[PDB]
Amino acid sequence: GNSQIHYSIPEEAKHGTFVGRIAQDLGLELTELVPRLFRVASKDRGDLLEVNLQNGILFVNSRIDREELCGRSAECSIHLEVIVDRPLQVFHVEVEVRDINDN
């Protein structure tokens, strides 16, 4: 089974920063996501990151800076749900922050 997937991204990741090949980890061709009605959403704000069918790479689409993200909590975990139509299901996506409290 391939439902549990997580990525790694260091804090202060300006919009467009690498996070983790969502498609590569999913096991689907970038030319199949389009017709598969690929979609991304979250229960928090629904606007944390986005996937690019170009290279199936995951880039930042929100505030990652420790100031915005959290900063305080050394270890910050994020949850996301990728809505895909045909097949009808969701992909568990968890991205953690990489940095230190001291700086």
In angstroms, the CA 27 to CA 23 distance is 6
Contact 12, 99 (CB under 8 A): yes
Q: Would you list the DSSP string of 52-91?
A: ETTTTEEEE-S--SHHHH-SSSSS-EEEEEEEETTTTEEE
Q: Where are the domains of the chain?
A: 1-99
For residue 49, give the 3-state DSSP assignment: strand
Residue type, 84: V
Helix (H/G/I), strand (E/B), else coil: 5? strand
Nearest 5°: CA angle at 31, between 29 and 32?
A: 65
Q: Please compute Rg for the chain using Cα positions.
A: 14
Residues paired with 93 in a beta bridge: 5, 80
Sheet of strand 4-10: strand arrangement: 4-10, 89-98, 77-84
Method: NMR
Q: Which CATH class is domain 1-99?
A: mainly beta
Which sign does the torsion angle of CA 44, 48, 52, 58 carry?
negative
Give the torsion through C-alpha atoms of 38, 41, 67, 17, to 10 deg. Answer: 0
